[PDB]
Structures are given as C-alpha cells and as structure tokens.
C-alpha cells in the first residue's frame, strides 16, 4: 500500500539540477508492540538536470509500521512566471504591439542563466508566429551535454480603439 | 470476440439526423458443418439528431459462425470543410484581414440550414477573439428541441510585407 507525494521543482532547478531534501513524518512501533512513535525523517533527493517532470522517485518502506508503504515522489514543474516548459524546450511568450509587429522591433529574450539576448525582426510578424532560439532550452537528460531550444512565441496586442480619423489613414 | 467499425457521419447528417445503411459481409456455416457461406447483410442504422460522436451502436452476433462477434459501429464526425464541431456547438473560423479587423467589417456567417447571417463589428477585433451566435449550433440530444450555438472565431490575416513608406504612416 504505497504513498504518493508531489515534488515541486522550479524551472531553474531543472535547468542546473538540484538537491531537494523533503521532511516527512512516519510511525514507529517502538519497544512495546503497542505504542507508536511520531519521529520524522529528512529524505534527500537528487534531481538530475532536465528531468522530464513526472519521473518517479521511490523510498523503500519509509511509510508507517505495519508492511510500511513505499513513499514515492512525483516530479512536478512549478509553473514559471516567464517561461512555459515544453520537454527540453522552454517557450517564451513575447507580448508585442501591433505597431511593433508591423514596423519591425527588437526582442530581448531572457536566458535561464540570467542574461538577455537581442533578436531583431524586420519582416511583418504574424500573431502566433514563433522564432526558435537554438540551445537556449533545458539540457537533455540522455545527453545533459546538449540543451533544448528556447521558443519565442509572439502575441500581438492590438489597440483598444481606433479614432474616427485613424480609420481613413489605415488605407 | 466482438468487432468494431467506424461510422462516418457528415455534420449536416448529425444536424438533422439520418438513416445510414451499412453493407457488411459475414459467414454462415450452411447445411454441412463444413462449408462456409459468403452472404452479406445491409444493417440499417438510425442516427438521432446531434449524437455526441463516439456513441456506440451494437448488432448482436452479426459476426461469423462460431459464437459470432457483436458487430459494433462507433459514431465518428466527418471533418467538415466549414465548421469544427464542438459538442452541440459548431465553430466557424472567420479569415479576416487586418484592415477589416481594425476598421470594422461584416461577417456573413453561414448556417447549417444553408442560409447566411450578417453580423457587424465596429470595435477593433482581436486575433483569437470569438463571437457566439445563439442557437445556430447542433440540437442537444437530451433536448433535440433546443440547439447549441455557432461560434465565430476570427483569424486576422496580416499583409505579407509593408512598403518602406507605410511604416512612416503607421504612427
């Protein structure tokens, strides 16, 4: 009769990999065969770079005291407030103005390392369009050596309203 | 040991409901206990208005000849070249130009009955935006009386390129 527990991991944590120690509380029958203990246990866990979230981590019979469940942790992606994980890829929503989308603009794409990258656009940018940024993603598990890509996904914000005059011009 | 068979139904067929007769071919042991027949069978099927596709239809032991499988048909939505079914709702993608999206336009929404409906738009239309059209959808099974809605989903087609001059103006 195992037990499941979610393991929250920041996107940067998955980028470089991290040590996460979890505090649990189980039961121990103690020198009686009647009384039960409270005692806890700090289970340490190594999260290897870019682990497809969802990967399971088991701790043998860490459960209670009659046989004790196998306490398992399921890796889960903490929603990040800048990127959307997509496997080894990390999507980056670019909120651009209609003017920018038409007359060209520059996008300072932020990196996991914590740096920025300038990417220029001359041609008309279509809503939905996306520019891939090679290797700016997450390291691939099988080959932590190489990393996935960063994907720019543009959102064109339109103006709220258009003056009676602007209409004329817009032809 | 049953047998499954997909049942292709046009969206209009699901709108009004239809009779669909399927031609199958089974086996019959014949007066021997050795020889086997070829003989077919035209299984008629009543498709009630707006049936959530996927609904199963069984034909008792229509299978072979030793016990014969139960030939079952799974309702499937024929992809329609104008609408996208969404339950009792039918989505309608409106390919509009950026000019139209900004200066207002008129959308002649086509109906399942085979008629058109004019819907006006004054305010700036945003890419992704959608206008619901009450009761223009598919009849609800539980209540064939009332129908679902027709949903307009706009797609703003941007111009391919913008002349060196247009840029200036666009401010």
UniProtKB/Swiss-Prot annotation, chains A, B:
It comes from the Eukaryota. The modification Phosphothreonine is found at residue 143. GO terms for molecular function: ATPase activator activity; ATPase binding; cadherin binding; Hsp70 protein binding; protein folding chaperone; protein-folding chaperone binding; transcription corepressor activity; transcription regulator inhibitor activity. Induction: By heat shock. Coiled coil: none annotated. GO terms for cellular component: cytoplasm; cytosol; dendritic spine; extracellular exosome; glutamatergic synapse; neuronal cell body; nucleolus; nucleoplasm. It is found in: Cytoplasm; Nucleus; Nucleus, Nucleolus. Keywords: Chaperone, Cytoplasm, Nucleus, Phosphoprotein, Stress response. GO terms for biological process: cellular response to heat; chaperone cofactor-dependent protein refolding; forebrain development; negative regulation of inclusion body assembly; negative regulation of transcription by RNA polymerase II; positive regulation of chaperone-mediated protein folding; regulation of cellular response to heat; response to unfolded protein. Interacts with HSP70 and can stimulate its ATPase activity. Stimulates the association between HSC70 and HIP. Negatively regulates heat shock-induced HSF1 transcriptional activity during the attenuation and recovery phase period of the heat shock response. Stimulates ATP hydrolysis and the folding of unfolded proteins mediated by HSPA1A/B (in vitro). Interacts with DNAJC3. Interacts with HSF1 (via transactivation domain); this interaction results in the inhibition of heat shock- and HSF1-induced transcriptional activity during the attenuation and recovery phase period of the heat shock response. Interacts with BAG3. This is DnaJ homolog subfamily B member 1. The lineage of its organism: Eukaryota, Metazoa, Chordata, Craniata, Vertebrata.
């Amino acid at each position: 009769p195992p037990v499941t527990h979610d393991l929250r991991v920041s996107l940067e944590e998955i980028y470089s990999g991290c040590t996460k120690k979890m505090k649990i509380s189980h039961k121990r029958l103690n020198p009686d065969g009647k009384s039960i203990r409270n005692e806890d246990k700090i289970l340490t866990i190594e999260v290897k770079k870019g682990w497809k979230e969802g990967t399971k981590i088991t701790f043998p019979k860490e459960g209670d005291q009659t046989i004790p469940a196998d306490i398992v942790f399921v890796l889960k992606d903490k929603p990040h407030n800048i990127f959307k994980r997509d496997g080894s890829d990390v999507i980056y929503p670019a909120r651009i103005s209609l003017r920018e989308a038409l007359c060209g603009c520059t996008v300072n794409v932020p990196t996991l390392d914590g740096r920025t990258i300038p990417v220029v656009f001359k041609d008309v940018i279509r809503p939905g369009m996306r520019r891939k940024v090679p290797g700016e993603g997450l390291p691939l598990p099988k080959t932590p050596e190489k990393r996935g890509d960063l994907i720019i996904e543009f959102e064109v914000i339109f103006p709220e309203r258009i003056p009676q005059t602007s209409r004329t011009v817009l032809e």
